[PDB]
């Protein structure tokens, strides 16, 4: 139930896989934690607004259409999730 | 001797492999746990459609690999092959974040 | 007594339901009245864009030798059309992946 | 009892069979296509609503969409879409 | 004569003399302010319009507007705006 | 026999015209029905942001000893405030200039 | 009647003035014509839609309100010219 | 010996002066020449509000200024002070342009 340290739920080799998909060849050790902070900022923003949606939707379950709203209000538009 | 590929060969091979592949790379369960953790910061008593979670994973990964390619070309401009987070901060700030 | 029910899409020779389009306009509250040719023109340019992107998807799928098109075929179709990349640069695609793009500086010698 | 939900995937499938009778499609790909239809629809509809709001217009005709698409579409796509919608609206007008 | 052109210059100038009784205004800065307020007005009303779409609701309430305020405003701006609008709504309710 | 007409702005005790903005909402093609307190609330928060920006701009103009506001101090107010700047990152100002920003690496020995 | 070369009316002192206001210290000699082309591209990007505006507004005079629209659909929101 | 400042210092003073100042830096008459030059390529005999051209100017050099701080950040980030067009190209790519 109560969760504490999912900051390291992203593993470093997952980041290396993403970086090879991201075309990166040589990766510093300092990269992973900074990218962790960046992704935390991005998810805090979008999930905060998703919570705003769901309380405005008066629901205790989130929907992916809320996620569609969360991606569209900065134009990060994704297809195929009920849109 | 036992064989050892020189550095960069294997890395470029995985670059080809994962530019070929389309799937999510982070394990879904710890990401889901992180989603629950972050959403708990705003309000308790929340359930989660799984479709929302995979949407978050795909959008997040696409966002990350896009900024990875951006920092990649930035480090290419900076005459390096080793990425350092100063490139990431420059890319965010010029991009506007 | 009354004429045969004949669809406006067939009248415009079209496929997309122009009645549904016009209804969604009316529920979209874009104007208090809408001219008749407006949802027809909407539908028609939607089959135009749809035909173009599905043409590109078919080109990708025949290049990818698979009969049923997949989101990877969609990504590979759209992202080598740079004109769409001006059109849809801010668009993300589920399970589409990325263009395989390795720079010559990553290449040795 | 299930609530009937409107989706364009049948229209996407028939468009695909028009351009490629031999070609199939996945359900998530049809979801992407329906998302595309809705996305372009809301873009063009909001843009047309604003252009109506500028010139104090309360009735939307295909001229306004023609303007708004030739705004939103660069290159040859705008010219070809204007031409095709012109033929469709014209022979509809005769109909 | 000419047609009346509505302006917020009187109302914003009243608010100005509320917060800065001392200072004057330029017409260029006031055109900036009017372009500002009309821009952000159509912004907040637009997201409220999408909320009306997503909630399938015909009548716009204040609740939807406070939600859209959490959508637009950065942080303590949003909380203070919620507070001030809450008090204004209460005394409007009591007229 | 009608009672004395107050304004809804006076009913909220505020500056902005509730009737004007509510009329804007009704003819904006946004909804057919609008609740009573929503334009009042919107006028209140517009008053809040207006007073906030105007107060900071007046302080900035007081910093450079002028009692009439100019777009330069508008730029100084909007860009030195991270919530305001983030809120209007995509916003251009005419004759506001930019924040003076000198890189220390450009500075000599 | 026609216009053939006003892009070389973009003086490199003006370019370097914007560079100083843009914070650029040392400038290569090859910069000027490329920035001229880039800003020119930006100009057609705006004025194409501005021409479309004036055409749909059924006029032969370009007004600043259409300029406001032309900047704003790329989100380059400029205040003081709307009204 | 006649007075002569070392290079860059006058450029620094220009930077400071222009970061305080807000006025247009191009002579405007060639700017309307360019405006009508580009405008007649879409439709000829279009007339212009002078305010329309001033809005075009303010947006234009505003975009150029922001591009110039990004270009300066690129020039610094590759361990230099002098700009080259590769800064501009990288900025155009990372801005999505």
Residue numbers in the entry:
A (entry chain l), G (entry chain p): 20 to 102
B (entry chain k), H (entry chain o): 37 to 133
C (entry chain q), F (entry chain m): 10 to 118
D (entry chain r), E (entry chain n): 30 to 124
From the article:
We were nevertheless able to refine the structure of nucleosome 4 as part of a tetranucleosome in the 4×177 array and also in isolation within the 4×187 array. The linker DNA connecting nucleosomes 3 and 4 was always visible and always showed the same trajectory as in the 4×177 structure. H1 is absent from the stacked nucleosomes of the 4×177 array, but is present on nucleosome 1 in the 4×187 and 4×197 arrays, and is present on both stacked nucleosomes in the 4×207 array. Furthermore, exit DNA of nucleosome 1 shows the highest Δβ value for the 4×177 array, which is the only array in which H1 is lacking on this nucleosome. We now report structures that show that short NRLs impair H1 binding to stacked nucleosomes and suggest this is due to altered linker DNA trajectories. Altered linker DNA trajectories, as observed in our 4×177 array, sterically preclude H1-linker DNA contacts that are required for stable H1 binding. To confirm that our observations are not a result of low salt concentrations, we solved the trinucleosome core structure of the H1-bound 4×177 array at 60 mM NaCl and confirmed the presence of nucleosome stacks and the absence of H1 on stacking nucleosomes.
Here, we report cryo-EM structures of human H1-containing tetranucleosome arrays with four physiologically relevant NRLs. The structures show a zig-zag arrangement of nucleosomes, with nucleosomes 1 and 3 forming a stack. H1 binding to stacked nucleosomes depends on the NRL, whereas H1 always binds to the non-stacked nucleosomes 2 and 4. H1 contacts DNA with L1, the amino-terminal part of α2 together with L3, and α3 to stabilize the nucleosome and contribute to chromatin compaction.
